[PDB]
Design a protein around this ligand. Sequence first.
Ligand code: S9T
Ligand code: S9T
Lengths: 142, 142
Amino acid sequence: GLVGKLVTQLEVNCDADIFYKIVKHHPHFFTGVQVTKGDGLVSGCIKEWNYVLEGKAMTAVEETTHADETRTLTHHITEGDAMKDYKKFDVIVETNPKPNGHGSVVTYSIVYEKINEDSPAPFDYLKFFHQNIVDMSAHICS
Amino acid sequence: GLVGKLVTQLEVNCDADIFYKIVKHHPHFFTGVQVTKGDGLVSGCIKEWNYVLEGKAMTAVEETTHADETRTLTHHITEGDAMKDYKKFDVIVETNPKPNGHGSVVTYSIVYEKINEDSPAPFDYLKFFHQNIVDMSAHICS
Ligand SMILES: COc1ccc(C[C@@H]2NCCc3cc(OC)c(OC)cc32)cc1OC
Ligand SMILES: COc1ccc(C[C@@H]2NCCc3cc(OC)c(OC)cc32)cc1OC
């Protein structure tokens, strides 16, 4: 099966709307541009990343869009090392209140389509994104 | 955050109800028992597994339940190496038709609660369950 999705979901002790605003505004570096929607206000960005994953230097080009009303960030990868393995690679970050009312659930989903049946599934990316949100979440408190 | 869920979802070219029936009936071995519901018909099982994960021999005790009407298998781990890292570890396997009507989507979810913030998230288990369903899925065809 070539099409799949990997998910990591974590509970965080933080209001969903604030946490989303934190995530939205944030060896590696990027160059790139911001994207606007017509009113001159930034609606997203396009970045070329240089990063190291499990010791190997890689590049990617990522177009990011946000949806404030659903607290969703979407990172659409168009180019780079990952596209040697995947025809499609998108990363969707959602933040929602726990039905308990107070804290939040953060979901990172990697939606992918492999080039062929010999391509890996992106467990190395899932672990990276997971640890990154754990790390960010451990620099926040009430 | 101590509570989380890992998911791998895969598309399979197989009718959901047949695929669920295949999954339901299937270095490692197990000993154990079957569980009935009162009519003498098997409703589940309780197994003690001996298995090797990333080279290390481990044991677990797993109680499995099924739900035919939702094509869901639930594996509830009560004891074993994994419980050195997790207070709770459940594995839920769902099979549903693609809204396209024909093939299926198979979802393995690992629902976990870590013992403490230094416990790993179960990416090693997610990869194992993923490869196992890929392998099974590559022994089936129309
Ligand atoms: C192939 O997919 C991607 C590759 C890189 C990114 C960028 C991502 N954001 C912060 C900096 C950064 C740093 C990294 O390693 C140090 C990294 O590794 C995967 C990923 C990222 C994002 C990606 O998709 C969201
Ligand atoms: C800690 O959680 C679990 C541990 C073992 C199992 C049993 C599982 N089923 C087939 C045989 C088998 C064989 C394995 O390695 C050869 C294995 O590794 C994780 C897992 C399994 C299931 C588990 O949860 C579903």
